C-alpha cells in the first residue's frame, strides 16, 4: 500500500518583469529553489513575497551563509581555495518613489 498525496501547487507565482505589489507572493517552495533578494521576504514556508511595489527581477548572486548557521559554514569551509558557491535571488526593483513634497499652504 501507500500514500497518494495531492499536488502541492508550489513554484513561481510571479515571473521576471511582472509588476508585483507589496505583499504579493512571488514564489513558493520547499527548500530554496530561489532565495530572497532585495526587498523580498521569506515566510515560515520559505515562501518569497514582495516587500514593496515594483518589478520582479531574478539574478545569480554570490552566496554567503550566516556565520551562526552551522551546516552552510561547514560546506563553505569544505570547498577549494578559489571556489564560490553562487545561488539564484529574486529582487523587487521598486517603481514609485516613497515620497513627494507637496505645498500645504502659504503662511
Amino acid at each position: 500500500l501507500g500514500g497518494k498525496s495531492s499536488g502541492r501547487r508550489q513554484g513561481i507565482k510571479k515571473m521576471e518583469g511582472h509588476y508585483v505589489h507589496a505583499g504579493n507572493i512571488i514564489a513558493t517552495q520547499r527548500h530554496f529553489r530561489w532565495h530572497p533578494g532585495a526587498h523580498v521576504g521569506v515566510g515560515k514556508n520559505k515562501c518569497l513575497y514582495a516587500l514593496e511595489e515594483g518589478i520582479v527581477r531574478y539574478t545569480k548572486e554570490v552566496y554567503v551563509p550566516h556565520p551562526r548557521n552551522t551546516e552552510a559554514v561547514d560546506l563553505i569551509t569544505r570547498l577549494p581555495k578559489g571556489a564560490v558557491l553562487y545561488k539564484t535571488f529574486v529582487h523587487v526593483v521598486p517603481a514609485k518613489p516613497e515620497g513627494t513634497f507637496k505645498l500645504v499652504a502659504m503662511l
Binding site: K60, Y63, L75, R78, L79, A83, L85, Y86, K87, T88
Partner: protein, 95 residues
Amino acid sequence: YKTKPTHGIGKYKHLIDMTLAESYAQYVHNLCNSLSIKVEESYAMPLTTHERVVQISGLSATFAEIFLEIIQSGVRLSVXXXXXXXXXXXXXXXX
C-alpha cells in the same frame, strides 16, 4: 534554468618525558602540514611510558627521505623500518 546558459552556476557537490614526546609529535605534524602531506590521525597510546603517533600517507622516495632526515634532526622513532634515537613516538607511514 536548465536551457539557459547559466545552467550549473550553483553546482557545488562536485567541488566537495611524555610532555616532550607530545611536543615532538606536534612539531612533526607542523612539518607535515608545511610540506603538504596528508596527516590522517594521531593517537594517545598508554616507571611510566608514553607513546604518540602521526599517521601519514603518500610521499615520493626522495621527498620521503628528506622528511625522514628532518625528523631525525631527545626520545625515539619507529616507522623499510627506520628507528633512531637522540617517552616514545611512532610515526607510522603509508607510502
